[PDB]
Design a protein around this nucleic acid. Sequence first.
DNA 1: ATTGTCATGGAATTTCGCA
DNA 2: TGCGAAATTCCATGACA
DNA 3: ATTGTCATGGAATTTCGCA
DNA 4: TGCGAAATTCCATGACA
Lengths: 368, 368, 184, 184
Amino acid sequence: LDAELDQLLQGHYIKGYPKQYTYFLEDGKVKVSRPEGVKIIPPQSDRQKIVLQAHNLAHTGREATLLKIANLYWWPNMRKDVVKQLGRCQQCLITNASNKASGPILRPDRPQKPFDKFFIDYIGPLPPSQGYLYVLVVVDGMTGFTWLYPTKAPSTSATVKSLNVLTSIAIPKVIHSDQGAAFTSSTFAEWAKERGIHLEFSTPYHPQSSGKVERKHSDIKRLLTKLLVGRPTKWYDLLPVVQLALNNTYSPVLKYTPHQLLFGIDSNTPFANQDTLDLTREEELSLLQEIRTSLYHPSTPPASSRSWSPVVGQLVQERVARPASLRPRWHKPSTVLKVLNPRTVVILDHLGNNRTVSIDNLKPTSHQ
Amino acid sequence: LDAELDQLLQGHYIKGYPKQYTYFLEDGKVKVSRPEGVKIIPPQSDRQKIVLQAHNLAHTGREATLLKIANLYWWPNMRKDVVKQLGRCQQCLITNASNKASGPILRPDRPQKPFDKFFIDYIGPLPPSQGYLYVLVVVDGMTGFTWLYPTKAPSTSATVKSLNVLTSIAIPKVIHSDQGAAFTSSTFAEWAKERGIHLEFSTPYHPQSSGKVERKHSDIKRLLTKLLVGRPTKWYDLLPVVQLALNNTYSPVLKYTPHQLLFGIDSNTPFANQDTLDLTREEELSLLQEIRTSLYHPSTPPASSRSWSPVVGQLVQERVARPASLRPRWHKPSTVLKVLNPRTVVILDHLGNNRTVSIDNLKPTSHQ
Amino acid sequence: DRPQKPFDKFFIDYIGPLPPSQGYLYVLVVVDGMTGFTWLYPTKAPSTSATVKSLNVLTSIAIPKVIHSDQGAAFTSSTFAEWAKERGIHLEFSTPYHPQSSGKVERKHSDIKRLLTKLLVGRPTKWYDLLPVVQLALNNTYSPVLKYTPHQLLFGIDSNTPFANQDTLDLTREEELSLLQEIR
Amino acid sequence: DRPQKPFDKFFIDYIGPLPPSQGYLYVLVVVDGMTGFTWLYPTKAPSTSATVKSLNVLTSIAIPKVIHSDQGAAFTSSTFAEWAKERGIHLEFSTPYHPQSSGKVERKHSDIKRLLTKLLVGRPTKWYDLLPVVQLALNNTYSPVLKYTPHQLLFGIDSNTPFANQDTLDLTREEELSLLQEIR
DNA sequence: ATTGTCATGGAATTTCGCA
DNA sequence: TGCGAAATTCCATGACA
DNA sequence: ATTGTCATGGAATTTCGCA
DNA sequence: TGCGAAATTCCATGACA
Ligand SMILES: [Mn+2]
Ligand SMILES: [Mn+2]
Ligand SMILES: [Mn+2]
Ligand SMILES: [Mn+2]
Ligand SMILES: [Mn+2]
Ligand SMILES: [Mn+2]
Ligand SMILES: [N+]
Ligand SMILES: [N+]
Ligand SMILES: [Zn+2]
Ligand SMILES: [Zn+2]
């Protein structure tokens, strides 16, 4: 806009241009003498190009982009123009890291009863032991009771074989797993459907969602490690011992073992508890029902000072799963369709797909 | 000690045994009727064995070990005996994770002058580009000015070639690097010695120690990524452009570019600063000397509520560098010989070697 | 004396030989004395090593105070005695020629034999795959004496397969024929 | 007018042909007008493409406002003109047959020729490896006019190689002989 | 069409043993 | 009640992915 | 014989433009 | 001085290894 800059030269007032300054012409350029020195005021129609050029030198954020521009130019509200172009630079949007933390984690209620919900997962690959490389880990959600099965592969067929053995004891209402191939196959879906078992799946690339079983990997591997110190890593023969040891281990916050939570009485293992020896089984079971309902439940921790929570219609970007070397870590912006809970949302891609994702794998798109 | 348990049975007082309880004999065992129920009091000489047996079931910590024992037994100060055996179980000491955080980081003074200290490092491997796979990155510590060299390998010979080119401009007092093979070879030591350059080495497996250059990888890879969006990853031809772009980028906390900090005036690049156009070079250089001494210096952040700091004579354990599957994450205990600063110590192994290590790669040995 | 509890006593016994099913010929039957809960393990032989291998699986879940059996060779061997001793399990034996000790247990044995006969009609080599179904039926069968299923007494909850037992309690004609055809 | 500054003007020129050193035959000499700071680049030819390649290295560190040269073909080509234009560099040329414009620069040229002659005695093909040494000597040479070394004027600090210049300022007998032997 | 978990071992807090 | 020692409970830290 | 760093973009704080 | 808008400064967050 040279018309706007015209009035300015002949001393008239234009909004945004502080009136206490002298706006002169020199070398066919409008200039102002500002406290920092003399600056060129470009016409409106030149400004987007100037911002773009300064930004593109190193694809810099707000302040770094502004410092370049301000070396030569001045105009009203320069940062407003800077932020407009940052919000439109696709390269920066998909490459830059977020500086906002996810909102605070949920602590879902413990399942009410044993066999209400199993969490299942694979550990491995481990050093080969009798030809086996993996462990299927099945954790009852109420009790924390855990079954271990050695397998040769993290496959559906091995999952099915192991679970046919386990479910001889009882059938769970729900099986929760991640999106590993063993669990998402149609063969596994059929297996579950035959048995009246509902399959439940974590949002993708979010092991925390299966935290109950992921956390068990740690105790299992730690015990195996301890038992194998100074020996070849022959873990196959140790699995049954580790299963039994861990199922009879007290959790200090609970003051019960998973075995006790499942059966209500210790079996013939070392240091068996004897407090209900004089009760009948019916009384013992009645005590058990009460113990189960009164276990500690953790609460949601406080939000960190700069966290975000999703809102329907908000622009967000999904983390790229396995980004290649020198490729962006984020997908193109998408829109939040549904907030399932404060930590889980349904998004629509630019390519029209509905995806249920964890907020830990989203960033809110910067610069509105 | 049956003698001790003898006096107890005939009603006499022994220290540690609360006098308000009835200590009877049954099945050839000394027993006490405690609020929780009847417990066996084993003789002193039996107690270490009992603790060991309960602990060894699942190699459990203090409370979990205690809960097992207390199912059957009672004696004075049972946890004191539990902790004694936890402190002696090697398997647990070398396998368990620390629950104490490192003390707060140091923020070393910025080097006084350009060329006082270079930090050097390799990025890569990257996608092959004209046969090149790595980038040698050289960062001047005072200015943050950064030179980039494409190489085929992260080797001494390539490091030497690149540095012969760079040091044509000037020779640094000190070169700081990590313990990568390129930098620790006798050939590199000779190269540096010929030139009067002092070599300085990070403590092992501690990239933070080279944080000045590690942090640069991020800006370099981010810019390359941005420029390569939607194109094959041909980064070789972009290195010189990225070098120039980043050296002329403002850091917002500084309000200067590395170029400005090095030369005191912008060269003929876009949006060059013009504030010293009317000064002579001598005046410009005088302004530069003052700008260099007044840059922001960050201070040490506060300690977290449960951090530790090393003390001469303290037992500590070094993190195992690349632990194998199902093998311990910690070395056997060793002793702190010298505290170089609160974050860096010299340790003596059990095998007599002196090692300079970061406290981030130590834990203090548990249970005294 | 103290009330009876799960894991006080496991009664064990072999059933078989059965038609070959995936290499297997016998079922080791384990019944918890107090609850009636049944565990079934397929084996290739009624041997000490087959018994130990099967019971290593069961005892990774729960260890009995006492195991009760007849005087079958697999159970009276010194190897099985040492296995039991290692685990603090007391072995109890019925006197020779009086192999039947507990009626509750024997009822379970005939329930198993009957359920197998019903299920194996036209598919005698398929029992390996059917063991889970049999076990679930047994353990969700109401006991008129105890007034609960073994599942309820072992876990203290209702089950998700309450109608796992569809046993008509006597063999039909075709079921008796298939059993007859198998021996012939 | 405004005081002179580093990067106002780079004077460039070729020196050579020299004895072959690792395939290289020429040195492109770049001198910053204000500071006297010298950059040396080995090339295989005094060509536009060699000049552009060398100057792509230098201009990844600092871009001059003006480049000054004689009318050598490498510098007057349309390709070099377009290279300069892409980077906002103004090209300035001395008139033909008056190739010497700045005495400060010409003194540097003879310093280079003299330093090379001294260093290359008995090793004429070894100059490639010696370029860094030459450059360091030049840039740490006190200027009686300016009262500083080029290093001090470019960086505003003292240098870590203050005694890089050991030039005796005239050739000795053996040095003049080695130069004589090279042409013969 | 869903959602973090929990062993660990010093420190903080509460209970015990005695008066 | 009130004191000092022992027991228990709290909970930051790190590690499973 | 040593040691973390710093781009980023909302929010918090300070300065500007005017009266 | 005192107000509202613009500019600048602060700084949690995450990522380089
Ligand atoms: Mn998984
Ligand atoms: Mn490195
Ligand atoms: Mn029998
Ligand atoms: Mn029978
Ligand atoms: Mn010439
Ligand atoms: Mn000349
Ligand atoms: N929930
Ligand atoms: N320092
Ligand atoms: Zn950008
Ligand atoms: Zn241990």
